[PDB]
Amino acid sequence: GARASVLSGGELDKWEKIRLRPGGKKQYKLKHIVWASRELERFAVNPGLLETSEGCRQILGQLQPSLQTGSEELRSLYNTIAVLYCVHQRIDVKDTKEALDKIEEEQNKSKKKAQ
Amino acid sequence: GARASVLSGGELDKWEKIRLRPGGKKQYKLKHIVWASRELERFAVNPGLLETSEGCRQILGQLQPSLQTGSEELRSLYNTIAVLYCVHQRIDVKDTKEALDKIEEEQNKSKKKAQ
Amino acid sequence: GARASVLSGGELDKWEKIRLRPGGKKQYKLKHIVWASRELERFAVNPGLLETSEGCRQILGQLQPSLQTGSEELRSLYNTIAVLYCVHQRIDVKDTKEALDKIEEEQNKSKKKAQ
Amino acid sequence: GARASVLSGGELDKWEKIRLRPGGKKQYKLKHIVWASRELERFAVNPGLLETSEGCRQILGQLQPSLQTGSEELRSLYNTIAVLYCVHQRIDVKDTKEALDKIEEEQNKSKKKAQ
Amino acid sequence: GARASVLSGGELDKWEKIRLRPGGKKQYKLKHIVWASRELERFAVNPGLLETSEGCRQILGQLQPSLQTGSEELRSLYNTIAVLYCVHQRIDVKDTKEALDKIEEEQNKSKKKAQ
Numbered sequence: 001g002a003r004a005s006v007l008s009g010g011e012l013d014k015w016e017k018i019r020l021r022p023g024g025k026k027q028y029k030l031k032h033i034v035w036a037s038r039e040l041e042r043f044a045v046n047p048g049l050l051e052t053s054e055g056c057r058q059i060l061g062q063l064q065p066s067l068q069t070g071s072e073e074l075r076s077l078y079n080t081i082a083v084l085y086c087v088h089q090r091i092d093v094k095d096t097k098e099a100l101d102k103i104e105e106e107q108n109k110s111k112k113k114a115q
Numbered sequence: 116g117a118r119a120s121v122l123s124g125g126e127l128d129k130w131e132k133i134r135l136r137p138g139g140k141k142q143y144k145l146k147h148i149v150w151a152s153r154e155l156e157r158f159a160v161n162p163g164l165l166e167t168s169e170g171c172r173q174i175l176g177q178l179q180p181s182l183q184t185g186s187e188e189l190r191s192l193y194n195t196i197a198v199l200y201c202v203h204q205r206i207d208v209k210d211t212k213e214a215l216d217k218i219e220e221e222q223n224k225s226k227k228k229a230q
Numbered sequence: 231g232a233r234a235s236v237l238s239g240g241e242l243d244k245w246e247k248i249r250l251r252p253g254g255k256k257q258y259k260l261k262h263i264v265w266a267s268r269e270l271e272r273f274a275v276n277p278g279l280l281e282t283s284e285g286c287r288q289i290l291g292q293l294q295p296s297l298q299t300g301s302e303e304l305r306s307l308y309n310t311i312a313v314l315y316c317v318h319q320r321i322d323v324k325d326t327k328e329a330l331d332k333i334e335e336e337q338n339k340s341k342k343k344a345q
Numbered sequence: 346g347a348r349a350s351v352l353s354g355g356e357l358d359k360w361e362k363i364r365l366r367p368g369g370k371k372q373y374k375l376k377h378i379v380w381a382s383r384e385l386e387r388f389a390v391n392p393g394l395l396e397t398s399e400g401c402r403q404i405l406g407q408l409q410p411s412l413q414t415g416s417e418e419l420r421s422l423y424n425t426i427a428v429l430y431c432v433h434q435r436i437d438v439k440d441t442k443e444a445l446d447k448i449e450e451e452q453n454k455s456k457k458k459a460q
Numbered sequence: 461g462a463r464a465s466v467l468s469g470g471e472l473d474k475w476e477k478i479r480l481r482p483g484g485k486k487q488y489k490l491k492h493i494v495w496a497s498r499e500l501e502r503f504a505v506n507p508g509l510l511e512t513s514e515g516c517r518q519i520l521g522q523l524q525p526s527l528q529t530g531s532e533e534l535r536s537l538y539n540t541i542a543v544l545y546c547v548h549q550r551i552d553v554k555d556t557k558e559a560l561d562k563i564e565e566e567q568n569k570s571k572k573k574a575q
């Protein structure tokens with residue numbers, strides 16, 4: 001399926017069109033996820049969770065209470081996974097802030113039915 | 116993005132362990148994926164249908180009325196997609212028949228709510 | 231004192247007779263314990279815990295909410311600690327799987343005393 | 346404003362007047378803060394929290410669940426942060442034992458409002 | 461730890477985002493703080509008040525009867541202290557006119573309750 005993910009219409013075509021900060025001029029590149037797998041190996045977490053929507057959801061849930069306490073490098077790792085989740089859900093975003101709004105709307109829906 | 120599919124216990128590891136017919140001493144090789152891409156390219160099919168399991172189901176759905184008419188090569192393409200579906204859904208498939216039983220389970224379930 | 235550790239029928243004498251994996255020829259070695267003890271620095275955990283059954287059990291309790299997202303290294307350490315707990319409590323387990331069942335059986339009994 | 350904490354009665358002055366232990370002639374030095382910061386950066390914790398008591402109260406919460414199994418270095422780091430909290434809120438602490446008497450006492454007092 | 465103040469996202473990263481006057485392009489610079497320390501030293505007042513939000517809030521109450529008759533330097537100094545109060549509360553103030561509104565805004569609220 002990785003062979004399809006690299007075609008011009010797939011998930012990794014979508015990945016490199018996304019902006020850093022709504023005003024910004026930088027974009028995501030493929031090695032951002034490679035770096036995210038390196039951090040998951042450092043923190044002893046299965047890297048295969050990046051390949052799934054369910055794996056990405058739980059990792060975002062693990063990261064969540066420690067974001068402010070953590071440095072902006074941790075937040076960069078979280079943002080990388082939040083953008084990837086948005087790609088896995090087949091939705092386009094223009095920037096990271098927009099991807100974070102997508103996680104927040106899903107959390108608003110999820111929160112209602114989590115009792 | 117993709118990280119476990121290439122590793123042991125992953126999708127390619129299942130591909131090279133799954134038997135062509137249940138007692139057979141030959142397993143699927145990676146060339147069948149390339150051949151399946153070529154048949155799908157000949158049909159002019161969307162590549163995202165090999166990224167997701169629902170897409171594999173669209174391919175399976177069109178193939179399904181054609182199987183009885185089809186050659187063993189046409190049926191090989193169906194079995195190839197059926198294994199990729201089961202593999203993408205992380206089923207510990209040992210052979211082609213087990214992959215088919217799971218595809219049959221999905222049809223039987225779909226029929227159960229088709230009223 | 232220290233001299234009693236290597237006494238025959240003792241915990242060290244038993245460790246080497248135990249299978250790493252049920253079907254295999256691979257036995258547990260003291261090098262596994264040495265590697266595990268080093269990696270407590272990585273978790274920021276006291277090595278003195280490995281002396282005592284209660285300390286080993288606390289290591290299992292710390293590992294517990296990470297197990298299902300953890301990488302194969304985390305599972306390998308958990309499994310190793312479970313065999314160490316069984317050896318410390320003088321329970322004859324022939325391989326890793328028996329230890330995993332017995333650690334669970336204590337927790338399952340504890341569960342009806344815990345609220 | 347940080348430059349006005351260099352003055353007698355300020356933060357730098359209170360820090361270096363506190364004994365490391367309840368016994369022995371060794372006192373805390375500003376270089377201990379550098380080691381504690383370097384460990385917090387290694388754990389990927391935000392330095393921006395170190396000038397704020399609310400930030401320090403969070404850092405004390407971050408270290409708290411792992412104290413039980415914690416290394417002597419992790420416990421020493423916790424003690425170092427605890428003295429900084431006392432220094433920030435200008436408590437006249439003579440040693441680590443007074444800082445930790447005051448913290449248990451403040452926790453008992455805090456618990457009687459928040460529960 | 462005191463490095464937090466000059467960290468990006470710290471107080472003195474914020475100090476330089478502020479324009480001196482609504483129509484001026486020059487920013488607030490760190491020497492305004494050094495100057496304020498010297499002005500306090502010249503008129504025999506302890507500079508420790510600078511390190512804290514409350515000491516700045518108190519200076520604004522104290523120098524309030526001095527504003528009506530004081531010199532341009534006195535008004536500049538009062539405005540500098542209002543900006544420090546705003547910076548201690550980590551506010552991205554556009555300019556002096558805003559810093560002054562922020563002080564009045566908290567004062568109407570405080571004056572009702574601090575009787």
Ligand SMILES: *C(=O)CCCCCCCCCCCCC
Binds near residue numbers: 004165
């Ligand atoms: C999905 O299509 C399974 C195919 C085999 C896994 C491919 C792993 C990535 C190899 C490098 C990219 C090749 C692109 C044609």
Ligand SMILES: *C(=O)CCCCCCCCCCCCC
Binds near residue numbers: 033117
């Ligand atoms: C997720 O799908 C992101 C895709 C980018 C993966 C790039 C991996 C590069 C690995 C290079 C070293 C090993 C092969 C020579």
Ligand SMILES: *C(=O)CCCCCCCCCCCCC
Binds near residue numbers: 231232233
């Ligand atoms: C430790 O302090 C000794 C405790 C009492 C003896 C335990 C058994 C020791 C067996 C190995 C050494 C035998 C020496 C004659």
Ligand SMILES: *C(=O)CCCCCCCCCCCCC
Binds near residue numbers: 346348465466472490
């Ligand atoms: C308030 O007085 C705090 C600092 C105000 C302006 C920042 C300039 C740098 C101060 C720290 C210097 C440290 C030198 C080792």
Ligand SMILES: *C(=O)CCCCCCCCCCCCC
Binds near residue numbers: 379463
């Ligand atoms: C936090 O920044 C604590 C600062 C303590 C300064 C004095 C001791 C260390 C001096 C050299 C390293 C300075 C790093 C900011």
